Structures are given as structure tokens and as C-alpha cells.
Specification:
Length: 49
RNA sequence: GUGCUCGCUUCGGCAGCACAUAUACUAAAAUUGGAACGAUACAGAGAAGAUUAGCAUGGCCCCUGCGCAAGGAUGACA
């Protein structure tokens, strides 16, 4: 994940590992990329793409 | 090597004499081997109970039925 830990806070590193389990950061990035691709696809005649 | 012997002997030289007394891992070079938790690659919830559904058994208290043993009170003229 893109979380930076400013100090070993063990009671928070675990709660952040739980939240971003199963590669949630990568899936969020992929989902946003795909949603932007779709919106640019629906607008390609007016946008001259 | 320096200096000296009344030495041979000549200043071209020779013989002897005093001092000098035992350094070095010694090494400039020879070669072929075995090698990360450093990177990238993979995984990554990197600390939880490792569960909850029935029925029957076991304990206590009644009720009913059957059996065993030992008994109590009562009833019946022609």
C-alpha cells in the first residue's frame, strides 16, 4: 500500500494491514483507471479521440 | 677501509697490527575455488475462538403402567 508509517505504531500497522488485505490498493487503482477509460470512451467523438 | 710498525722496503708496493662480528613474517610475484537476506520475482490478514445445531445419556422431583418382595384395612345371604 501507499501508507507511510512515521514510527513503529504496532497497534495501527495491524489495523492498516487488515484494511488493505487482498491487494486493495492495487484494485482501487485499477478500478479508477478502468472507470476513467470508460468515461473517456463514451466521450470520443466530441473529445476528438 | 682508516691509521700505525723505527719490519722488507720503495714512496709504486709488501708482511703484521688496533677498531668493524652475523639483517630478513623472510615475499615483488603464483594461481583456482566457495560465496547475500542486496535487487528483482512470488505470496503476503504480519496477533484472535480454531466452531454451532439436534438427540440421547447422567443428577433431582413428581405422575402413570408392569413385575418382585413384604405387608395393612375392609366386604359379601341361600
Amino acid at each position: 500500500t501507499g501508507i507511510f508509517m512515521h514510527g513503529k505504531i504496532p497497534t495501527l500497522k495491524i489495523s492498516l494491514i487488515q484494511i488493505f488485505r487482498a491487494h486493495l490498493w492495487q484494485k482501487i487503482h485499477e478500478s479508477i483507471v478502468m472507470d476513467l477509460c470508460q468515461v473517456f470512451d463514451q466521450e470520443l467523438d466530441a473529445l476528438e479521440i
